[PDB]
């Protein structure tokens, strides 16, 4: 699969709004992930004790981790598919150190789409959401191929 430039521009135009406040978007996305799929919280040894959304919102560590994760995703998206170099360390850590199944990358993709749909109707109409889904699908397809090369799943 290959995105068109027009599709990449829809992706980047909503990402530009994420970047007004990546920390707040990261909190919403990670909290949505943990609420929709609580099993995913068990993968975060630093956070797995948190019991409520209030505790999650107050966690400086969770906020910082959301900034780190979304910034890495943003760098991937800005490569517009030419992301081999960026996927290498991310695939290795997520396959081998953190043990994140592809299914959980699907869950976080769903959380990203949900939060962008809620926060950014001006830049996340149907065409823009379709483009973001395509970009995240490409990300997951390429990282899954790397997982397999690395010996995981
Ligand atoms: C868009 C998808 C994702 C991106 C771009 C991303 C990015 C990152 C980055 C950059 C780091 C720090 C460097 C590293 O260890 O690789 C990290 C750490 C981590 N990620 Fe992800 N991640 C994603 C999805 C997930 C998911 C779905 C989970 C679990 C369900 C997860 C679990 C973790 C954990 C446990 C750490 C270590 C956190 C810590 O040290 O406290 N990641 N991630």
Alpha helices in the chain (DSSP H): 5-18, 22-36, 53-58, 60-78, 84-92, 102-119, 126-150
Residue 15: alpha-carbon gap to chain centroid: 12
Does the C-beta of 90 come closer than 6 Å to ligand 1? yes
d(CA 8, CA 95): 27
Experimental method: X-ray
Q: Pick from 139, 143, 147: which is nearest to 96 by CA?
A: 147
Q: What's the CA-to-centroid distance between 122 and ligand 1, angstroms?
A: 29
Angle (CA) 107-58-65 rounded to 5° is 50
- Domain extents in the chain: 5-150
Distance 124 CA to ligand 1 centre (A): 24
- Give the residue among 35, 21, 24, 3 at the shortest CA–CA distance from 108: 35
CATH code for the part of the protein at 5-150:
1.10.490.10
Asked if 13 and 128 count as a contact pair (C-beta separation under 8 A), the reply is yes
CA distance 85 to 152: 19
- What does DSSP assign to residue 125? S
Instruction: In whole angstroms, give the CA distance from residue 126 to residue 139.
Output: 20
38, with CB counted inside 10 A (0-12, 13-18, 19+), is exposed
Contact 27, 42 (CB under 8 A): no
- CB of 3 sitting under 6 A from ligand 1: no
Mutate to test the pocket of ligand 1, among 11, 49, 65, 110 (most ligand atoms within 8 A of CB): 65
| Alpha carbon distance 13, 117 (integer Å) | 13
Nominal resolution in Å?
1.4
Q: Ligand 1: which of 40, 74, 90 to mutate, most ligand atoms within 8 Å of CB?
A: 90
Length of the chain: 153
């Amino acid at each position: 699969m290959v995105l068109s430039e027009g599709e990449w521009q829809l992706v980047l135009h909503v990402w530009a709004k994420v970047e007004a406040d990546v920390a707040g978007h990261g909190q919403d996305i990670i909290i949505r992930l943990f609420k929709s799929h609580p099993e995913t919280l068990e993968k975060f040894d630093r956070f797995k004790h948190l019991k409520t959304e209030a505790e999650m919102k107050a966690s400086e560590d969770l906020k910082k981790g959301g900034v780190t994760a979304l910034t890495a995703l943003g760098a991937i998206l800005k490569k517009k598919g030419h992301h081999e170099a960026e996927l290498k360390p991310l695939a290795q850590s997520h396959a081998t150190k953190h043990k994140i199944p592809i299914k959980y990358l699907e869950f976080i993709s769903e959380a990203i789409i949900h939060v962008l749909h809620s926060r950014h109707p001006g830049n996340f109409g149907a065409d823009a959401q379709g483009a973001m889904n395509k970009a995240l699908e490409l990300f997951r397809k390429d990282i899954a191929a790397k997982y397999k090369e690395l010996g995981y799943q």
